Design a protein around this ligand. Structure first.
Ligand SMILES: *[C@@H]1O[C@H](CO)[C@@H](O)[C@H](O[C@@H]2O[C@H](CO)[C@@H](O)[C@H](O[C@@H]3O[C@H](CO)[C@@H](O)[C@H](O)[C@@H]3O)[C@H]2NC(C)=O)[C@H]1NC(C)=O
Ligand SMILES: *[C@@H]1O[C@H](CO)[C@@H](O[C@@H]2O[C@H](CO)[C@@H](O)[C@H](O[C@@H]3O[C@H](CO)[C@@H](O)[C@H](O)[C@@H]3O)[C@H]2NC(C)=O)[C@H](O)[C@H]1NC(C)=O
Ligand SMILES: *[C@@H]1O[C@H](CO)[C@@H](O[C@@H]2O[C@H](CO)[C@@H](O[C@@H]3O[C@H](CO)[C@@H](O)[C@H](O)[C@@H]3O)[C@H](O)[C@H]2NC(C)=O)[C@H](O)[C@H]1NC(C)=O
Ligand SMILES: *[C@@H]1O[C@H](CO)[C@@H](O[C@@H]2O[C@H](CO)[C@@H](O[C@@H]3O[C@H](CO)[C@@H](O)[C@H](O)[C@@H]3O)[C@H](O)[C@H]2NC(C)=O)[C@H](O)[C@H]1NC(C)=O
Ligand SMILES: *[C@@H]1O[C@H](CO)[C@@H](O[C@@H]2O[C@H](CO)[C@@H](O[C@@H]3O[C@H](CO)[C@@H](O)[C@H](O)[C@@H]3O)[C@H](O)[C@H]2NC(C)=O)[C@H](O)[C@H]1NC(C)=O
Ligand SMILES: *[C@@H]1O[C@H](CO)[C@@H](O[C@@H]2O[C@H](CO)[C@@H](O)[C@H](O)[C@H]2NC(C)=O)[C@H](O)[C@H]1NC(C)=O
Ligand SMILES: *[C@@H]1O[C@H](CO)[C@@H](O)[C@H](O)[C@H]1NC(C)=O
Ligand SMILES: *[C@@H]1O[C@H](CO)[C@@H](O)[C@H](O)[C@H]1NC(C)=O
Ligand SMILES: [Ca+2]
Lengths: 243, 159, 157, 241, 157
């Protein structure tokens, strides 16, 4: 029933929920695609998940997903209970997960870039292979350096709009990538006010260096947030208990 | 009236705690709270209780102002009223479904308000029409339409 | 403080706080709960009105049990702009011990009745057929033998 | 033709008492398989069940341009619900239920500036006609030179003669900025209260303008702005203990 | 009793940190829910979803009427949906009622004709039900004997 997982503060953690684990079907057989499941995870002893966790699922046929980046104040031991609820036989099953929020290892990541991928949805990015493909595609522009995901969030949580299904329009996702090596000239130029001025009236964003994410990743280029975490925030004042 | 101390407490006459405010967090020991404000409580995410009552107001009103209300229970949904009545209204449709089971209509009298009329003419095509029969089990079944009665001809279905 | 009842009131007289033995009355015009994972009330709630926020949908769900609703004076269900769907799996029972069932929709469909099968001799049980009186009240009559849905005495209007 | 889908919800329209409020229906609220946009559908507003909204109601829906406009009354504080029906050429209708909040302004009684304009005639037709009130507010905004009607916040209409009092929502709450108040006074009338010719031209031909006055409120409640004021006496509360 | 009368009310703050732990000036200091409450009695609960425990029912007990209003539809799911109505059951739609699935009816309570009650000579107005291909129901007048569902016109559109 229970399972133990390891998590690092300020990093993306994804644990897909699949019919095979909950329905406990035989390994040598495959679960029929006609089955339907609607999981609902919640904190133990409480009716919903904490702030830093998120649950998403497209259709009952598709597998569910738990994601989110733990916050430093949420370090320790946590228990998450998942209640799978079949929609055909109307019978439920329960499972537990144990999460141990560790601590980040190695040097800090002080250079962060927030993108906006309009060619993918939060369901198609959570699995490991698309995320790795995106990381390798972005590695060319940020070379030298290694990129590790820091935050993934659906656009609908950021005041987005449901897209009209005309040809291929999708909600889009926000991906935050952190690294320790300083940005190249291309990323600095993209974040320059000239691009903002250009797309203010409708001119295409300035892009001199060769793109690599295309055509598999249509990215809104003049909306890319650059954050430098060098010179960290000063210590906040604290009150000493009086006599 | 300003009370400046480290631990404020209100007890019963015997000594059972009734209320306590300190640096840690406020605690209500009587096991009941009551807010008399007209705006009422404003929750954030969810509420987990095993019983919802309507005090002496004698009227409960569940409402979803701009989206669809929905109930759910895997073991079944029960609605009870010893001396009341059910009035289901809808401006679009009323769909009752059962994937595998039956639809029992237990009532001494059942009335159908709206039902049009059709002239009985042999010239029309027999196909595309059916006649409803009810065998002593209680279930209903269909028979191919015809100029004469045919319920007894296809009475094998509920054997 | 000890005693039987502790209260706070304004000069005109208005209970801003009162912690008696039974309950703790608070005069706040609006209580706000800011929990992120929800709140748990072991015993119950007592409200005359439940109203979802104007961006979400109410959902009275029980995760692994049945939902029982009691209302002695009657139940009314309204869906002003949508179907009043009711999906089950085992049995959908509409009971009325000493009343009636009325269906006032503009049309009625029953598109899953078990289709019959042809039998030359058939069976001998009297398969009743359904016939409607003048005022819309249904009744059952014996299978095709002599008379028709007639033979009803005076039970319908 | 499959019935139109409700791609995006509205579910909330905010409004404050007195100020003119208007909302344009977004271009992706509805979507049909053929028309493919809400502007090609037929939008209508309904109160409840299927009954229509009366022409005397404080909320009106201009369907051809797909706009909703209104001026909530002083006694309509609270929450209301409505329905938006989208009908295509095939007769299929999609309904979206939304809710309108009418709330009192945060500066309801702390407004630094309170105005007053006197108009000859009767106030009975004006009070019970939303279109006339909208026209009056728009004419006032045009007279002041500001094309945005959302600034003016009407408060009261009296009997006998049409005496209308309002505030300027743009004006800061604290402290009272006297200089633009006196500039508006110069642009609107003279020192003795006789209206500026531009004001008379703008207000006409709806009503007849005779005189206006501007008093103080908020922090500087002891000041009158029309240049006939004896401004020196204020609170005048200086006792001796 | 132990009464306090004032224009504002009692206020308690810890001298060590000088933070108001509990004030009765609700407008300036909002009220936070104190831990340990088993039941709550509020005038209006603007929640978003009500759930029972992982192993308990959700009982809804009232004494008067219960009014349910979903402004965009009311959806009910489960295994066995029951309506133990003590009076009348009135489904009043406006476009159609779709009685999907197998339909049954109690024969022991419905008025069933008996054999040997041909006393009524007068042929009162009566109808026999009929099931169109698409699903719509329509009644046909009964005149003679041994007649079924043959109709020249098209009643079900
Ligand atoms: C993020 O970046 C993408 C593409 O790079 C933009 O589509 C998106 O919104 C757009 O933002 C730019 C400026 O950042 C703006 O020029 C675009 O049009 C404006 O829209 C505002 C909306 O109020 C108008 O007032 C203004 O006159 C322009 O027309 C805007 N696109 C749209 C469709 O609104 C960017 N989002 C954010 C939050 O920056
Ligand atoms: C409520 O008060 C504000 C004051 O902040 C008014 O805004 C000003 O309105 C006037 C006329 O409506 C405008 O002319 C002001 O714009 C400025 O005007 C000067 C000339 O006076 C120009 O030289 C400037 O270039 C600028 O255009 C405007 N002030 C600002 C900062 O926008 C507002 O109108 C008033 N409400 C109403 C209903 O009149
Ligand atoms: C990863 O992205 C998510 C996207 O939602 C971030 O969650 C958001 O975090 C901010 C910062 O806390 C929240 O804003 C404010 O949070 C405070 C609590 O500190 C709260 O009191 C305020 O009311 C306000 O909510 C924001 O709400 C939250 N988003 C959601 C949907 O809850 C998250 O912080 C990001 N994490 C990292 C490491 O980048
Ligand atoms: C989930 O919530 C349900 C709420 O019903 C919990 O079950 C209830 O637990 C309480 C314990 O405080 C039981 O009260 C006890 O009842 C017995 C017998 O009546 C009585 O002798 C005791 O003095 C006490 O009052 C209550 O009966 C019980 N109800 C049901 C229906 O089981 C349950 O424990 C909760 N589970 C978790 C994991 O939180
Ligand atoms: C009355 O109940 C029956 C039983 O569910 C409904 O039949 C169901 O109708 C839907 C839609 O027509 C079918 O879904 C379709 O299934 C096919 C595969 O067969 C798939 O290719 C389509 O994309 C679509 O998903 C469903 O299979 C069918 N169920 C059965 C058991 O036949 C019927 O629609 C209900 N009547 C009304 C008026 O709603
Ligand atoms: C008229 O008023 C409306 C709202 O009161 C203005 O729309 C927004 O106004 C706020 C603050 O006034 C700005 O921050 C937004 O950028 C405005 N939205 C836009 C411009 O799309 C509107 O700009 C006003 N128009 C005039 C001519 O004053
Ligand atoms: C904390 O200690 C410092 C000593 O430097 C003192 O000045 C300060 O007042 C203390 N904090 C509080 C809240 O009293
Ligand atoms: C001004 O409005 C208030 C609102 O309470 C009303 O009582 C008063 O009669 C109004 N005065 C005039 C002159 O219209
Ligand atoms: Ca809605």
């Amino acid at each position: 029933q229970q399972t133990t997982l390891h998590l690092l503060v300020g990093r993306v953690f994804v644990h897909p929920l699949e019919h095979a684990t909950f329905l406990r079907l035989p390994e040598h057989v495959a679960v029929p695609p006609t089955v339907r499941l609607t999981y609902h995870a919640h904190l133990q002893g409480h009716p919903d998940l904490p702030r830093w966790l998120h649950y998403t699922q497209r259709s009952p046929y598709n597998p569910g997903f738990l994601y989110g980046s733990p916050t430093p104040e949420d370090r320790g031991y946590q228990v998450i209970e998942v209640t799978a609820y079949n929609r055909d036989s109307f019978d439920t099953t329960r499972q537990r997960l144990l999460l141990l929020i560790g601590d980040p290892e190695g040097p800090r990541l002080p250079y962060q870039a927030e993108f906006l991928v309009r060619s993918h949805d939060v369901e198609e990015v959570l699995p490991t292979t698309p995320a790795n493909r995106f990381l390798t595609a972005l590695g060319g522009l940020w070379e030298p350096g290694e990129l590790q995901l820091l935050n993934i969030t659906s656009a609908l949580d950021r005041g987005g709009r449901v897209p009209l299904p005309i040809e291929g329009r999708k909600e889009g996702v926000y991906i935050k990538v952190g690294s320790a090596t300083p940005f190249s000239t291309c990323l600095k130029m993209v974040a320059s006010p000239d691009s903002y001025a250009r797309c203010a009236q409708g001119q295409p964003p300035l892009l001199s260096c060769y793109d690599t994410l295309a055509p598999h990743f249509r990215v809104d280029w003049c909306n890319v947030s650059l954050v430098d975490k060098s010179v960290p925030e000063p210590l906040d004042e604290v009150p000493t208990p009086g006599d | 009236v300003e009370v400046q101390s480290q631990h404020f407490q209100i007890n019963s006459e015997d000594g059972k705690p009734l209320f306590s405010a300190e640096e840690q967090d406020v605690v209500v020991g009587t096991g009941r709270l009551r807010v008399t404000g007209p705006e009422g409580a404003l929750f954030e995410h969810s509420v987990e209780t095993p019983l919802v009552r309507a005090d002496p107001f004698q009227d409960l009103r569940l409402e979803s102002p701009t989206r669809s209300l929905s109930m759910d229970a895997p073991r079944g949904v029960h609605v009870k009223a010893n001396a009341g009545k059910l009035e289901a209204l809808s401006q679009m449709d009323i769909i009752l479904q059962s994937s595998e089971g039956v639809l029992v209509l237990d009532a001494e009298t059942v009335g159908l308000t709206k039902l049009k009329q059709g002239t009985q003419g042999p010239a029309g095509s027999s196909n595309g029409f059916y006649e409803i029969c009810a065998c002593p089990d209680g279930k209903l079944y269909l028979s191919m339409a015809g100029e004469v009665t045919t319920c007894e001809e296809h009475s094998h279905v509920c054997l | 403080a000890y005693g039987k009842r502790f209260e706070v009131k304004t000069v005109s007289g208005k209970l801003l706080f009162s912690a008696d033995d039974s309950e703790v009355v608070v005069g706040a015009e609006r209580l706000r709960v800011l929990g992120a994972e929800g709140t748990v009330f072991p015993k119950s709630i007592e409200t005359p009105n439940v109203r979802a926020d104007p961006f979400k949908e109410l959902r009275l769900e029980s995760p692994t049990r049945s939902l029982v609703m009691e209302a002695p004076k009657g139940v009314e269900i309204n869906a002003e702009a949508g179907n009043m769907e009711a999906i089950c799996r085992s049995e959908l029972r509409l009971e009325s011990k000493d009343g009636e069932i009325k269906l006032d929709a503009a049309k009625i469909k029953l598109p899953r009745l078990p289709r019959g099968s042809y039998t030359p001799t058939g069976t001998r049980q009297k398969v009743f057929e359904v016939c409607v009186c003048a005022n819309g009240r249904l009744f059952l009559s014996q299978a095709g033998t002599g008379s028709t849905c007639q033979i009803n005495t005076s039970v319908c209007l | 033709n499959q019935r139109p889908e409700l791609k995006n919800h509205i579910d909330r329209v905010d409004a404050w008492v007195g100020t003119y409020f208007e909302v344009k229906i977004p271009s992706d609220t509805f979507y049909d398989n053929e028309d493919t946009t809400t502007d090609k559908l037929k939008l209508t507003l309904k109160l409840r069940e299927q009954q229509l909204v009366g022409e005397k109601s404080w909320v009106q829906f201009n369907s051809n341009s797909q706009l909703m406009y209104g001026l909530p009354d002083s006694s309509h504080v609270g929450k209301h619900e409505y329905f938006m029906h989208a009908t295509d050429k095939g007769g299929l209708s999609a309904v979206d239920a939304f809710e309108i909040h009418v709330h009192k302004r945060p500066q309801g009684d702390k407004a630094p500036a309170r105005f007053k304009a006197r108009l000859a005639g009767d106030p009975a037709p004006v009070v019970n006609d939303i279109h006339k009130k909208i026209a009056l507010v728009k004419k006032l905004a045009f007279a002041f030179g500001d094309r945005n009607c959302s600034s003016i916040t009407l408060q009261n209409i009296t009997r006998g003669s049409i005496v209308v009092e309002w505030t300027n929502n743009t004006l800061p709450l604290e402290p009272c900025p006297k200089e633009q108040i006196i500039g508006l006074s110069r642009r609107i009338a003279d020192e003795n209260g006789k209206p500026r010719p531009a004001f008379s031209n703008a207000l006409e031909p709806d009503f007849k303008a005779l005189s206006i006055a501007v008093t103080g409120s908020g922090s500087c409640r002891h000041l009158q702005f029309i240049p006939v004021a004896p401004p020196s006496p204020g609170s005048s509360a200086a006792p001796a203990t | 009793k132990t009464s306090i009368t004032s224009d504002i009310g009692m206020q308690f703050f810890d001298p060590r940190t000088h933070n108001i732990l509990f004030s009765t000036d609700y407008e300036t200091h909002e009220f936070h829910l104190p831990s340990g409450v088993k039941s709550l009695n509020v005038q209006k609960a603007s929640t978003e979803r009500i759930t029972s425990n992982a192993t308990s029912d959700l009982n809804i007990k009232v004494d008067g009427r219960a009014i349910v209003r979903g402004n965009e539809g009311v959806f009910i799911m489960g295994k066995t949906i029951e309506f133990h109505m003590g009076g009348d059951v009135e489904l009043k739609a406006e476009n159609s009622i779709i009685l999907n699935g197998t339909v049954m009816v109690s024969p022991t309570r419905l008025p069933s004709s008996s054999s040997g009650d041909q006393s009524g000579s007068g042929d009162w107005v009566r109808y026999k039900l009929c099931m169109c291909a698409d699903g719509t129901l329509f009644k046909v007048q009964v005149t003679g004997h041994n007649m079924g569902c043959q109709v020249s016109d098209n009643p079900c559109g």
